[PDB]
Amino acid sequence: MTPASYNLAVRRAAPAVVNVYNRGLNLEIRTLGSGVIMDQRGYIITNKHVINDADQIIVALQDGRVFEALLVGSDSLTDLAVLKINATGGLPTIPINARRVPHIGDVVLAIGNPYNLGQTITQGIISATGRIGLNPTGRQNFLQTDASINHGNSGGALVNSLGELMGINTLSFDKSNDGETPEGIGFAIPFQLATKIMDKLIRDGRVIRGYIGIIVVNPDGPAANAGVNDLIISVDNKPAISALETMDQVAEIRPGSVIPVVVMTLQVTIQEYP
């Protein structure tokens, strides 16, 4: 017999996870975290809060290479950031299977640099999917995991036993108002959302969202200027059945774009989310 092991996932995915250093003038490491190399061009996902207000951003590979990284862009709403470094040599890249559907109870591995001890792998499962996270106000989708996450793990990889990316570790549940200590409660941005946000950031240098300042309707907004208690049955020639699916459609639409909003036909001009 051989020892039960997830070293295969480790060999495949770990080389693609990097140490990220946020340096600020005082230069001195103001904070640190992790990042994932997404493809050969040198694009790297990480968390925004890791690279916020950095004067210089450093990336380090497990193979020893170090790089000054360029901030391509970031998104507060998803707390995601994209970096760029230029490598003549090949780069390690994270295995991605865009067809893989993460399931509750899938074994996962958290790859990151906890407390700057050097790269660490930890093992758990997918505790839950579709979680708003720590903030009820925040309307996001998170994978939940009991793989041990610590300071230094943010921006790093969460992978299944095959080494495929399942998410980006964002944060651990560390707090209660009471001060009770949570155990095994950690969150990651789902990889499909992280990929969509990365592509947006690469293209526009920021996430450009549609805003329409508003299905039953409950200032100076696109809607207000187009012309309460109104019933929107169709938005941009798409049946408004669910309010969640529509607000996602709005987001997608590019600012400056004019669409027909049927209500029981107004011409609205989409604008950027403030």
């Binding site: 309307r139 549609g210 329409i212 508003i214 409950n218 309010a243 969640l244 529509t246 607000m247 709005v250």
Partner: peptide, 4 residues
Amino acid sequence: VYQF
């Protein structure tokens, strides 16, 4: 119920 949302805002968008």
